[PDB]
A paper describes a structure:
Many proteins, including the [name]/[name] histone acetyltransferases (HATs), contain several targetable domains. [name] and [name] broadly regulate the activity of other proteins through their protein acetyltransferase catalytic activity. These proteins contain several highly homologous domains, including KIX, bromodomains (BRDs) and HAT domains, through which they interact with, dock to, and acetylate target proteins, respectively. [name]/[name] are critical gene-regulatory targets in cancer, with existing high potency inhibitors of either the catalytic HAT domain or protein-binding bromodomain (BRD). Using crystallography, we identify the binding mechanism of the [name]/[name]-specific BRD inhibitor CCS1477 in complex with the [name], [name] and BRD4 BRDs, and define components of the CCS1477 catalytic binding core that are required for compound activity.
Residue numbers in the entry: 1082 to 1197
Write the structure that this text describes.
Amino acid sequence: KKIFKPEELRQALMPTLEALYRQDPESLPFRQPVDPQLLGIPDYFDIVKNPMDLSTIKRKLDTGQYQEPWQYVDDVWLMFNNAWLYNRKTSRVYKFCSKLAEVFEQEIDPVMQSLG
Ligand SMILES: CO[C@H]1CC[C@H](n2c([C@@H]3CCCC(=O)N3c3ccc(F)c(F)c3)nc3cc(-c4c(C)noc4C)ccc32)CC1
């Protein structure tokens, strides 16, 4: 039973977020919030109720909004889940999402090792 102290957590989690950002081009569609007006997809917020993206995860990590690892993981998962939900499996964005989820599953493992 491990309970992370706040700044040990930020230092534990930030490398996993940097690993997502470092995927180029795969992280590019995820670096800023989806703007349905600019992209001419007005149904986006009908399907994606709770948007999430790397810039929002970064800001939340930087402002102590993740008190335990599972809250951070939840938001990362949410940004993947939204992208798989909204996009077709053949699309670049969908395949890029899968690449990032693959990276995340490797990079989050040491933190998970510490918890269990
Ligand atoms: C850096 O400026 C950005 C790059 C990605 C651009 N983009 C693009 C542009 C549109 C024009 C065609 C194209 O190839 N884009 C693009 C550009 C860079 C990419 F890495 C990429 F995978 C796709 N499509 C986006 C889709 C999404 C998306 C997500 C995430 N979930 O549901 C949807 C819909 C998000 C961003 C998309 C928008 C401007």
